[PDB]
Amino acid sequence: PKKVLTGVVVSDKMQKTVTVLVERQFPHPLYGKVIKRSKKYLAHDPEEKYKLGDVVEIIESRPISKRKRFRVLRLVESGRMDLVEKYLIRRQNYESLSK
Amino acid sequence: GRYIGPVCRLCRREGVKLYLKGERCYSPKCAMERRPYPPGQHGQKRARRPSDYAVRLREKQKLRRIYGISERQFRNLFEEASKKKGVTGSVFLGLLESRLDNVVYRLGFAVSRRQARQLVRHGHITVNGRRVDLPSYRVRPGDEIAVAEKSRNLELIRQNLEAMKGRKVGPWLSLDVEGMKGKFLRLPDREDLALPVNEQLVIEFYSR
Amino acid sequence: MVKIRLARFGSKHNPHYRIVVTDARRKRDGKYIEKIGYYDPRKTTPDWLKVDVERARYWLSVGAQPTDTARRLLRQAGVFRQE
Amino acid sequence: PTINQLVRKGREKVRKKSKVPALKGAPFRRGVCTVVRTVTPKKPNSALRKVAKVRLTSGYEVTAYIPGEGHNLQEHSVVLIRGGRVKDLWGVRYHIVRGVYDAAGVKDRKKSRSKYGTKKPKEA
């Protein structure tokens, strides 16, 4: 089991590389609620074939750069941009918050 | 240093006869006739309604001084019997009453509990043929406890034994008085034994 | 290299050994690959040695190397005995 | 608070301040005296309490009580410090153990002696 996850591509900007956002949920070990976290995975797209908004399965793969350890398996859902504009809204959120 | 000091005195404190004395704790001297108060300047003074603590402490002390062992050894016992499957009280009793020294007493090879200890520790006894000179030793049942022969004719032995010709023994025990063998058959339940102690108050003392 | 030997389990003076497959560079007393038996020099029991050959034999087949005192115990349970 | 509050925020675990820098953490620390002196206590009491400002091996200089009936210390008497505070004078935060170093025991106490540092006399 090379681990395989799934998530949304929020990153177009790379030569041969995509950013996938993978959510997980899980019970919180004291307060008990189930809580929902995630990370940005840096991913390998040799032919530039996965495009913004796609929702893809992601794979544990032999190493690619400082940071890509993951190649894209398959497409599952195509074009759901709510996800993309939720995380994207949250990053435009950021730069409230400072000085 | 174990207890080892005046005694018909703590008969007095504990507020009732214990027989750590043997012959003469059955006298009309046990000092319990003649003196049902406690030691001290204040023994004859009017009582004070005791503390829940007090009472529990007292019960423990009683149980202790009867069996006549150290707090340490005693508590390590209770804790042990607490841990074991079964009812913490009656097991305490089982275990206590399962001490070699006390088996010797209960088999009547000695007059008092303390005598029975010195008896053991001086080499006089054997459990299933090998002399066993620690008094703590646990008698498991099916164990036979004899005066070993070198001591079989010495004085005090013949004293007790030939004086216990005819007596009944505790019903978890057997006696061949000729051979001065005895068998520890089974374990005592609460009223298999006698004791002037509400054991449950001891359980409570330790729950503090 | 991989070794079949003694590892010391008693107390001071009351010396019990585990028979043991291990890479020879371990502490003798440290973590090991398989326990294959026990050995009690002072012969305190009815059984002061046990082996289960079928297992020892496997390791032998892969170049497990018994120390001498090891191999005496092995062949003592006749892990070695031919027919 | 809600649970999403607790998940979001959490509970604050809560620490305590030592009632001493006898420092290290050490259970006693030695030192030498600067002043050895007599002080008065607060509202409900009067006496003359006896105490030493002591410079310590922990670098800190402190005041220590000098317990017990009577005593021997002076300017360079060096003594060991114990810890334990004296209610009703101010900032005496440690006690002097008597009978270690230059601090003598308390002469003639027949009674509670292990405290007060006095040797069991000969029952004769």
Next chain:
Amino acid sequence: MLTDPIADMLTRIRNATRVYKESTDVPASRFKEEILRILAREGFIKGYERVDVDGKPYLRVYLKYGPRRQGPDPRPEQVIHHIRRISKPGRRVYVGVKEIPRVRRGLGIAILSTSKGVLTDREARKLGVGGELICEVW
């Protein structure tokens, strides 16, 4: 809307009985019906029927209490002395089978929702399954 529906059904029951109402309506759901069914069978409510109030579906619980008691405060013993929710939304509560709660020394129950469907503790145990712990009743 009602944030937790199921709760408000149990709390409706609660307020009803402590004023001794002979019955009460709860806006009808099927899983709510489920819980009711279990309360019924297990002896806590008199039973329930499915109804219509202004062309909307309700489930009228009828309820019980013990006898009239002597001395001052004749008020009669409650039958449902206590009933309480456990899983809520945004605190969800699930048990293994080994984690399934024994209640009031046994005199109570616990109604948990398995994928075997809705069960009393003791049912879930003989069935041997876990789920969302919904309530305890007793």
Next chain:
RNA sequence: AUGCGCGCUAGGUCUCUGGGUCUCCUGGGGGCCGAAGCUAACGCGUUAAGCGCGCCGCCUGGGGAGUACGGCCGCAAGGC
């Protein structure tokens, strides 16, 4: 000195604005007195301080102190 929202739990009385076959009924605000229930008491009680669910803010002995330092805001005074 009482965050918002929704649902449940006797009444009685005075009132403001609607609707009704207008004694009275039925909405939605404001008052008082009370059922159950709550509360340390005082009190609260369908305008909950009662029964429940969601979500936010917040509390953690008195003093030092809303002070010091830091940051941010302000012209300042001063604010957070």
Next chain:
RNA sequence: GGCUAAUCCCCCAUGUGGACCCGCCCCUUGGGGUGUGUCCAAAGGGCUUUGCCCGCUUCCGGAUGGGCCCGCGUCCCAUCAGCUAGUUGGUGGGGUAAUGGCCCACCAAGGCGACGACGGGUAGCCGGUCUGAGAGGAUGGCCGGCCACAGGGGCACUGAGACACGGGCCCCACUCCUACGGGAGGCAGCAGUUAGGAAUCUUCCGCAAUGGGCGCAAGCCUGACGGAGCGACGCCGCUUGGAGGAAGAAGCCCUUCGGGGUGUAAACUCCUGAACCCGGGACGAAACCCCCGACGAGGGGACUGACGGUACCGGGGUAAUAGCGCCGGCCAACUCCGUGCCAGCAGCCGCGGUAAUACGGAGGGCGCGAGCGUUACCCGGAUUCACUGGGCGUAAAGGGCGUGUAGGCGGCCUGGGGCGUCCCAUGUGAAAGACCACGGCUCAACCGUGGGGGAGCGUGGGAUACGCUCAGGCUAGACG
């Protein structure tokens, strides 16, 4: 400067085979074929010398040991809010056992962050441990696992492996020798010294055992280790006696001056017999080795014990250390005298200014006992950070009000998926430890053998109520 041997080093060959470029075949990240080309092997030694041992060589497997990589868990401060140029990806190359900005050239302009980046502080991590009803809190000494260092900092070399603690180089501090040119160390191995400190041991014996290195072997090395020593540091076992003995001596305390207490305690009587003396005296040790047989399987035979004349066994034998805290409530234990807001006690209240159960001594008592106290520290009590398991009208505590971003939460029906969720099977969850059972040292402590359980994560299979999710539908919420 000269000579010389090898299992040292080259050169040609043999090519089982393997390396590499290219081509096809299967297979799918660089796996297995296969074909042409090219490139690559070796080392001798001992003899019970013509056939056995120990070695060498290329290849394929095993086995053990590791490198690298990924999910997830992993302290405090937001009064640290932004961080980033090898940063981030691409191509090509360099390096390596091997992926990869690990490095380097060129190209692109990324990457990270309130799901807490960046900075600051603190810390080795675990198995476990301690406490706790649990949940939690604390901890990581000793034994085991992993990592990291070897006076500070760099750096390679040689090897299968190191970037090597008793290996090499350089810079730095420090020490020592020095013909002032230059040299020499590196106990965080055992012991020991010294400094520091409240404080932590012998410059011991042994190479008998177990384990390690080299040796065909005998053997050699082994402060790993097996043992002794020292400290009540800890635990466990044990002694300071056992039975009798007064209406109860003296002494001392109290006293209504009758008596009350110490107290069967003592004295005394009898019995036992720690200590100490004598005699025997271990187990741990049977292999390596030699013999027969085949250097095999199997059989037969010899040696070897530091601890130790110890443990243990038999004989003899003396009545043989008691102490410390406490006695106003919390809390088990009371009186007299002294003292007079003093001397002093004290954990909190509080006690002491002439009747003090609270200070000091006495007699008595209570508690533990080779210990008993104090100090420090952790958990606890403390449901006093409240998950279990708390609060906010006036006790601390509702933001001055709104608006909405993120985020949390989500009415009734039907259906698909089955992520949460639940069940089964299986793998994993090393050993110690914890628990249970037997068992071994006369018990225990300590120890062995067996058994049980276990959260979590991997893989397969299954359930679909609830939570999700897609689909479709309603109208009690919302809105028009």
